Amino acid sequence: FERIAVQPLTGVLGAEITGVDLREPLDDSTWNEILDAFHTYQVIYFPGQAITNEQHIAFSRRFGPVDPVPLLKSIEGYPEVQMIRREANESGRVIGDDWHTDSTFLDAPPAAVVMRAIDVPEHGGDTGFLSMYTAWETLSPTMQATIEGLNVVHSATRVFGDAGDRETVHPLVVTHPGSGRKGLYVNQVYCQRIEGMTDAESKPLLQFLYEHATRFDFTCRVRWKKDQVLVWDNLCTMHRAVPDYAGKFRYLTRTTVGGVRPAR
Amino acid sequence: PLSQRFERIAVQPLTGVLGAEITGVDLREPLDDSTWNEILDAFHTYQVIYFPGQAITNEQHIAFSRRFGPVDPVPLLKSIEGYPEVQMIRREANESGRVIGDDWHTDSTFLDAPPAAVVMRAIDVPEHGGDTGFLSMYTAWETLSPTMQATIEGLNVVHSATRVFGSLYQAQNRRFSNTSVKVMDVDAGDRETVHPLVVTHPGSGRKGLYVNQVYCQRIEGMTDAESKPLLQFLYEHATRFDFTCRVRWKKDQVLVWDNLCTMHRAVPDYAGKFRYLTRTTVGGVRPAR
Ligand SMILES: C[C@@H](Oc1ccc(Oc2ncc(Cl)cc2Cl)cc1)C(=O)O
Ligand SMILES: O=C(O)CCC(=O)C(=O)O
Ligand SMILES: O=C(O)CCC(=O)C(=O)O
Ligand SMILES: [Mn+2]
Ligand SMILES: [Mn+2]
Numbered sequence A: 001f002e003r004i005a006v007q008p009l010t011g012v013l014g015a016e017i018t019g020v021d022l023r024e025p026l027d028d029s030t031w032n033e034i035l036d037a038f039h040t041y042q043v044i045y046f047p048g049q050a051i052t053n054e055q056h057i058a059f060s061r062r063f064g065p066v067d068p069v070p071l072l073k074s075i076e077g078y079p080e081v082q083m084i085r086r087e088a089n090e091s092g093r094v095i096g097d098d099w100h101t102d103s104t105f106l107d108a109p110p111a112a113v114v115m116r117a118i119d120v121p122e123h124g125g126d127t128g129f130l131s132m133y134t135a136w137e138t139l140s141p142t143m144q145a146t147i148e149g150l151n152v153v154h155s156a157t158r159v160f161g162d163a164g165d166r167e168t169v170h171p172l173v174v175t176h177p178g179s180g181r182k183g184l185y186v187n188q189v190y191c192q193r194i195e196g197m198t199d200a201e202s203k204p205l206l207q208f209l210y211e212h213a214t215r216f217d218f219t220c221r222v223r224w225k226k227d228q229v230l231v232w233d234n235l236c237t238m239h240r241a242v243p244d245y246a247g248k249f250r251y252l253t254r255t256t257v258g259g260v261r262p263a264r
Numbered sequence B: 001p002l003s004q005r006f007e008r009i010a011v012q013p014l015t016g017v018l019g020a021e022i023t024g025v026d027l028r029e030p031l032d033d034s035t036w037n038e039i040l041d042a043f044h045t046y047q048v049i050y051f052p053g054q055a056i057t058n059e060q061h062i063a064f065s066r067r068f069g070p071v072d073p074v075p076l077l078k079s080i081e082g083y084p085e086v087q088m089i090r091r092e093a094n095e096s097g098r099v100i101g102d103d104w105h106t107d108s109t110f111l112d113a114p115p116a117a118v119v120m121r122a123i124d125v126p127e128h129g130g131d132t133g134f135l136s137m138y139t140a141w142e143t144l145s146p147t148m149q150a151t152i153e154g155l156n157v158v159h160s161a162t163r164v165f166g167s168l169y170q171a172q173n174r175r176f177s178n179t180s181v182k183v184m185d186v187d188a189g190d191r192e193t194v195h196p197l198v199v200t201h202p203g204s205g206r207k208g209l210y211v212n213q214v215y216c217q218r219i220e221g222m223t224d225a226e227s228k229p230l231l232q233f234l235y236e237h238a239t240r241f242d243f244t245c246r247v248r249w250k251k252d253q254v255l256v257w258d259n260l261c262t263m264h265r266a267v268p269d270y271a272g273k274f275r276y277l278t279r280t281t282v283g284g285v286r287p288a289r
Helices: A028-041 A053-061 A132-137 A141-147 A199-213 B033-046 B058-066 B137-142 B146-152 B186-190 B224-238
Strands: A005-008 A015-018 A043-046 A078-086 A112-119 A127-131 A151-154 A168-171 A173-175 A182-184 A191-194 A219-222 A229-233 A237-241 A250-257 B010-013 B020-023 B048-051 B083-091 B117-124 B132-136 B156-159 B193-196 B198-200 B207-209 B216-219 B244-247 B254-258 B262-266 B275-282
Touching (some): A005 A028, A028 A043, A028 A229, A043 A219, A053 A112, A127 A132, A132 A182, A132 A199, A168 A173, A182 A199, A191 A199, A219 B244, B010 B033, B020 B033, B033 B048, B048 B244, B058 B083, B058 B117, B058 B275, B132 B137, B137 B207, B137 B224, B193 B198, B216 B224, B254 B262
Parallel strands (some): B020 B048
Antiparallel strands (some): A005 A015, A043 A229, A078 A250, A112 A250, A127 A219, A127 A237, A151 A168, A151 A191, A173 A182, B083 B275, B156 B193, B156 B216
16 A cells, blocks of 8 residues: 555454545546555545545445435435434434445345544544455354355345335355455344245344354454544445434435446 | 542543443552552442553552452462462463464353453553453453342352363363463362352442353253353353453553453454453352352
8 A cells, every 4th residue: 555554453354444535536546555554454534634525426436336325314405415413302213323334125235334423522423344254254164155145135124114024135245346255144133034045044143143243353443433434344344333423413425336236 | 430539540441341441540659548548449339450651660550459458369370470469361472372362251160260450561561452351240240130030149150160171171172381380180170169140249249140151050050051051141142242341451451350240351352462461360259149
């Protein structure tokens, strides 16, 4: 890395990137290094990037087409820029407070999400991430061989479920179209059953994979500060909100980068 | 606000659940009463506290530890030459044996009187890799439903070291290297003790869950089949990600964790890299409701 400075967060995933101004267009050499760090570290974040809504969209477009997720509210004037907002007065349960990755009920879920902290507490409201590369790679060779050929049925029936009940089928293990690396691909929010198996057969196996994937040693924990811009890979990671900031205002915006069909 | 409540130290909470960074103090020196009382208050509130940039000697490490209570080294760990009170969490860059403490537990709960706290000091740690996770058993308890609390608050739990250096350990394959771990008597590993499932912290007066899957064998009076589901639920509940924090280490960071109201976990993400911390253990008293 010669155009940026990269500081890995853990031995598994996550890296802080400095030495670059996201308010400006990125030359080829700088963009290529950012993409290289993204593919390697899977979640990357840039402190001190007070970027406008328009600069947010422009940066996001470098990753791919900006295709908003279905269920979130957009800011006035910018359909692409969606809100993760919780009022100080707000009670109840937080958006995304279980391990998941976004919108896997889609035939082509999002490739990536670009999140920008606008107003965040001095402490509280971290976001957890984990690597599905590491999840797959830490399975024994025998377990890998055993489940590699399985497919899993996804649907949105528990988030907003007619379109919420529509099923799609994804491989249990997918090859990342950018890195070429294999990762586990299951999540408790959207996965319904292993295709072809009975309920009794499927439930314990999915349950094990949920437990395995979310092992603490496969995770990292990102702390937010105002003007922090973060990108996560929606194919090879999962993420989780942390609701430890009752009574405090928390506001981030996000753009969603379109992806292609998950493939073996 | 912390900036105005604390006059001798500066406190920066790590999460909304537990953990805090402490600065404005020199651990090389004896602590005056007001400074110590503020540290103890922060310890009781935040449950795991750490002090970056404290380049201290073994003697100073021991002296600071003694403010929390009497030193009482844990049975399993080797000590450094010249300092029986200072034990090692040391992993050579080339070793590939099981990593010490790589699942959620708290220390030596098989003792009739487990440690009250541990003071850990980073000697030589990787630039990245080897974080320690912590979680609050106050929060774990307080987030159970009223009905689940009523159901289990009267239970007691059987603890032993059998999976660490007793019969169950000796009957399996994953072994610890002799870098930091002593050879132990198998009968000592199998010795059972019974503690309450919910305990009152003597310093804070608060109630916390008290179970861990390393040392807990079963709920007293129950069969294994009866105990397995309740205990397994409690482990899953306590280790919910939103009940945790994650501490990253740097050389000369000194950390204190409360061995009664927290659990902790090593993270084995630094294969091929040297990692060395020292630690003193503060003696505790019999866990009580
Ligand atoms: C110093 C410490 O002793 C321990 C040693 C290893 C250990 O590792 C584990 N980690 C995870 C699992 Cl599942 C089993 C185990 Cl056995 C835990 C504790 C103590 O208790 O005083
Ligand atoms: O608020 C957070 O930390 C993450 C929420 C989430 O899951 C998302 O934005 O998709
Ligand atoms: O090495 C670590 O991070 C923690 C090891 C541990 O569990 C202990 O020292 O008791
Ligand atoms: Mn999400
Ligand atoms: Mn331990």
